[PDB]
Design a protein around this ligand. Structure first.
Ligand SMILES: OC[C@H]1O[C@H](O[C@H]2[C@H](O)[C@@H](O)[C@@H](O[C@H]3[C@H](O)[C@@H](O)[C@H](O)O[C@@H]3CO)O[C@@H]2CO)[C@H](O)[C@@H](O)[C@@H]1O
Ligand SMILES: [Ca+2]
Ligand SMILES: [Ca+2]
Ligand SMILES: [Ca+2]
Ligand SMILES: [Ca+2]
Ligand SMILES: [Cl-]
Length: 771
């Protein structure tokens, strides 16, 4: 019967954890138990035993300012404040970070660290970040916020561009990164040592940077999340191609803008950018192209190891040494997007941070989700940001607010959204929407929630969709159903020759997946590919087990069927960059030309059928630009690559069609269930319960549209019958060769009869009947 741990939970409650309380009495414990302050004895008011949980609840006048208390029994233990108690005493509502005045002559600087003994700012040269220029102690307020005003006293007349860190004493000096840092010094993770473990923050004034007429998107037809066609692009990928060697630097915001007309023409409404906030593992001074085909040890990074939640990465800047440049550059890009009638969605990664020490150094036992002993819960050798905790929630909501208001960002995609409490994300949305009425938010709603050990909460995951109409979630059900997904990637599915229950395909096309309840189409982000896992092309190739050279058109015919189904489904439409042309993550490396042993290459999947270079990367976060570059020749050079450019034009046409009628962008489940019909019922003609062909009717507000998809490897008769024979009076606008809104006078891959259609194998047909 020994004292293990101790936590003060409120003004008059200390919780002492023991190994056991069996056979010991309230009277025997009151005897041995004694409480002490910062050495004096505190009057012990009462104890209550929780024998089950093996802990005493101790009552007394345990006023915080009489230091932490330490509990005696037999060994002693100093009490720690619980995160709920730290919120009670130290939750701060005011401005955080460092704020420049108009002429840069002063800075107002705040940092939250309620258990710090002292907090010194260390200031480094703007023209050389390694050189220490000045230091200043900060003054702690009532709520544990450390403040200072930088001015003439430190010998600097203009602070803009100067860098800073915070040395924090506890007992232990540790140097930390202002979590509200608005920009940073050029960052190279190879400079990390024991003393400085992070990027240095930077004195900048966002409001004075970039286009001062920046404003939110002006998207036509856009009346909600259902009207969104999202396009997921990585800033490096989009311009890392060698063929672009004919204005702005490689793989930067300024480069990205030069290829916006493409996306304007492609028809997408929103460009979703992979994490543009600062991430840890990089050398931002090395912009050189990696030309070798590899899946490890590349300066390339998707950006899923977060360093800052407010400060942009230098990697996408032309001038990474100028901390103001990022902000002006990203604003320039976002402005350029808005002029093209489109919007931005920023991928944001709050679920975890690059290194636990990033926030744990600032204030131990607070920012992260925790185990019952105070130990921080971790993910990826990184900290799990516990966003039920007030100041952790602030980091998320304030950054959302800041990015929304300062960069005129139109939406956000939350990585591993199910790691967070619903409440944090709901507030995030509410605040972001308050700034921008047209705010759109999506996220990965995988049921992954961990939280604080013994404290369950509603997570921001798929099951949350019942009880909000705010944030939408990726539909892995439609993904898995159409062409397989993690963990069982490669399994033949609807467009890869494996028969699927047509009722569940039809329900998915209505934005009603089988694995969670979507009571509004806007709850569902429909997708078949993303940056994660194999690309659409590669998964198709693997699933049908064929070589991409020989089966190219077989694979592309199947790929176009996937895009047709996503782009004519209800809910929010999502397109992975390259999915439009047939992008591949082929491992064209000599040492991997044929299968190898046990000893596999990193993050690669094998296709047997293929002889030459059989390895394809399914997790390209650490892969070269050779693996990760968007192929512009494949996407726009009709002459050189007729098959991929056909798939591209086809995908464009489908987007055009989707935007041109609200038959595919309905608002409620009520009207979807009424106006979206299943033409191919089980039994009608050749149709089995599980099958590889399906067709459905929709109606906009009164043009009827009918989408037919034969994913079978043979031709198939679709029986219209009494109910749908009226379709024959309409006209074809999508066929084997082309997609759009104009009628096709000589359609291919389909034949019409008195009351039926004979559709070619691996072919999609769409008919319009205006009225
Ligand atoms: O970070 C790990 C992976 O996270 C993502 O995978 C998701 C899947 O996309 C999602 O379908 C879900 O898969 C589980 C599935 O729903 C469940 O029924 C099955 O029994 O277990 C599956 C676990 O694989 O959740 C996972 C993550 O938990 C992401 O797609 C992938 O890239 C990541 O590697
Ligand atoms: Ca177009
Ligand atoms: Ca500089
Ligand atoms: Ca809902
Ligand atoms: Ca890397
Ligand atoms: Cl893809």
């Amino acid at each position: 019967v020994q004292l293990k741990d101790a936590q003060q939970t409120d003004l008059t409650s200390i919780q002492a954890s023991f190994t056991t309380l069996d056979g010991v009495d309230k009277t025997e414990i009151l005897k041995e138990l004694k409480v002490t302050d910062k050495q004096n004895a505190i009057q012990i008011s009462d104890i209550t035993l929780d024998t089950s949980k093996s802990l005493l609840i101790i009552k007394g006048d345990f006023n915080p300012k009489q230091g932490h208390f330490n509990i005696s029994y037999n060994n002693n233990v100093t009490t720690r404040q619980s995160w709920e108690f730290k919120d009670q005493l130290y939750a701060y509502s005011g401005n955080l970070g460092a704020v420049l005045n108009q002429d840069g002559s002063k800075v107002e600087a705040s940092l939250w660290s309620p258990s710090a003994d002292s907090v010194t700012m260390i200031i480094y040269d703007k023209d050389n970040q390694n050189r220490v220029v000045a230091t200043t102690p900060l003054v702690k307020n009532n709520k544990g916020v450390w403040q200072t005003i930088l001015d003439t006293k430190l010998g600097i007349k203009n602070y803009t561009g100067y860098y800073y860190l915070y040395e924090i004493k506890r007992g232990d000096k540790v140097k930390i990164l202002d979590p509200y840092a608005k920009s940073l010094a050029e960052w190279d993770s190879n400079t990390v040592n024991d003393d400085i473990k992070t990027a240095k923050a930077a004195f900048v004034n966002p409001s004075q940077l970039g286009p001062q007429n920046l404003s939110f998107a002006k998207i036509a037809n856009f009346k909600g999340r259902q009207d969104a066609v999202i396009y997921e692009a990585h800033v490096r990928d989009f311009t890392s191609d060698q063929s672009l060697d004919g204005k702005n630097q490689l793989g930067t915001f300024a480069a990205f803008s030069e290829k916006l007309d493409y996306l304007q023409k492609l028809g997408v409404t929103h460009i979703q950018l992979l994490p543009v906030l600062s991430y840890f593992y990089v050398n931002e001074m090395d912009k050189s192209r990696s030309t070798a085909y590899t899946s490890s040890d590349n300066n390339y990074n998707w950006g899923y190891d977060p360093q800052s939640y407010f400060a942009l990465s230098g990697m996408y800047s032309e001038k990474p040494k100028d901390p103001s440049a990022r902000i002006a550059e990203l604003k320039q890009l976002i402005h350029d997007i808005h002029k093209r009638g489109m919007g931005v969605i920023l991928d944001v990664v709050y679920n975890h941070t690059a290194k636990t020490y990033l926030f744990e150094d600032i204030e131990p036992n607070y920012y992260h989700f925790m185990n019952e002993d105070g130990s921080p819960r971790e993910s990826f050798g990184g900290g799990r940001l516990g966003t039920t905790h007030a100041m952790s929630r602030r980091v998320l909501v304030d950054s959302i607010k800041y990015l929304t208001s300062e960069f005129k960002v139109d939406g956000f995609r939350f990585d591993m959204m199910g790691d967070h409490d619903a409440a944090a994300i709901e507030l995030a949305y509410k605040e972001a929407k308050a700034i921008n009425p047209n705010m759109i938010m999506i996220g990965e709603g995988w049921r992954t929630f961990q939280g604080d050990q013994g404290k369950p909460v509603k997570p921001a995951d798929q099951d949350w969709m019942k009880s909000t109409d705010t944030v939408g979630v990726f539909s892995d059900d439609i993904r898995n159903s159409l062409k397989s997904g993690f963990p069982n990637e490669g399994t033949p599915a609807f467009i890869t020759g494996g028969p699927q229950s047509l009722q569940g395909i039809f329900k998915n096309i209505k934005a009603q997946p089988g694995n969670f309840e979507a009571d509004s189409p806007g709850d569902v982000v429909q997708y078949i590919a993303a940056h994660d896992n194999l690309t659409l092309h590669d998964v198709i190739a693997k699933s049908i087990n064929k070589d991409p050279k020989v089966a190219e058109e077989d694979i592309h015919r199947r790929l176009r069927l996937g895009n047709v189904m996503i782009l004519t489904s209800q809910g929010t439409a999502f397109i992975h960059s390259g999915q439009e042309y047939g992008r591949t993550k082929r491992l064209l490396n000599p040492d991997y030309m044929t299968k190898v042993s046990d000893k596999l290459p990193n993050k690669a999947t094998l296709i047997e059928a293929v002889k030459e270079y059989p390895y394809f990367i399914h997790d390209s976060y650490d892969s070269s630009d050779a693996i990760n570059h968007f192929d512009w020749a494949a996407a726009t050079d009709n002459n050189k690559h007729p098959i991929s450019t056909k798939t591209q034009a086809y995908t464009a046409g489908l987007i055009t069609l989707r935007r041109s009628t609200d038959a595919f962008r309905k608002l409620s489940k009520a009207e979807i269930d009424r106006e979206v019909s299943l033409i191919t019922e089980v039994g009608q003609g050749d149709i089995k319960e599980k099958d590889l062909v399906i067709a459905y009717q929709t109606i906009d507000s009164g043009d009827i549209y009918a989408v037919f998809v034969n994913a079978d490897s043979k031709a198939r008769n679709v029986l219209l019958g009494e109910k749908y024979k009226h379709l024959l009076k309409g006209q074809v606008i999508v066929d084997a060769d082309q997609a759009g809104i104009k009628p096709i006078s000589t359609p291919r891959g389909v034949h019409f009869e008195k009351d039926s259609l004979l559709i070619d194998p691996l072919t999609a047909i769409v008919i319009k009947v205006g009225k």
